[PDB]
Amino acid sequence: VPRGSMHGRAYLLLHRDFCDLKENNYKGITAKPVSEDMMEWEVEIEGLQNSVWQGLVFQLTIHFTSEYNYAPPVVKFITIPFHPNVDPHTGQPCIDFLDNPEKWNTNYTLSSILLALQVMLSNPVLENPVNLEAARILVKDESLYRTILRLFN
Secondary structure, eight states, X not given: OOTTGGGOHHHHHHHHHHHHHHHHOOTTEEEEEOSTTSOEEEEEEEOOTTSTTTTOEXXXXXXXXXXXXXXXXXXXXXXXXXOTTBOTTTOOBOOHHHHOGGGOOTTXXXXXXXXXXXXXXXXOOTTSOSOHHHHHHHHSOHHHHHHHHHXXX
């Protein structure tokens, strides 16, 4: 690797963040660097408690950039899920602090992002969903909604 690499801002921040994540040993959350860069991650987040996704698992990839901490990583669903806020075409979750520049915060660490994702992805913003059918079905008969999720698993 290029000399001075192990000295990049993003790399050092993610390095620190990962040690923290490991120390935190958060139940229901797994994240592993899938590159020497520490830029590419593979993550699994269990469905929040007492939520429609109880018992389910969000399998995502998180791509950070050398701008990290000044910029949000890019999160994508490995397999496009039937979800009110996940772009059915991009597999990307509509999350404010991820899509709205004014919402990003340099206080967001790998841990924050993971816990925030868990809560948000388990509590859709029916307001103005990207996936209409998913939201619609969710609204009426959340039991059917679940049935569909299981079918998608």
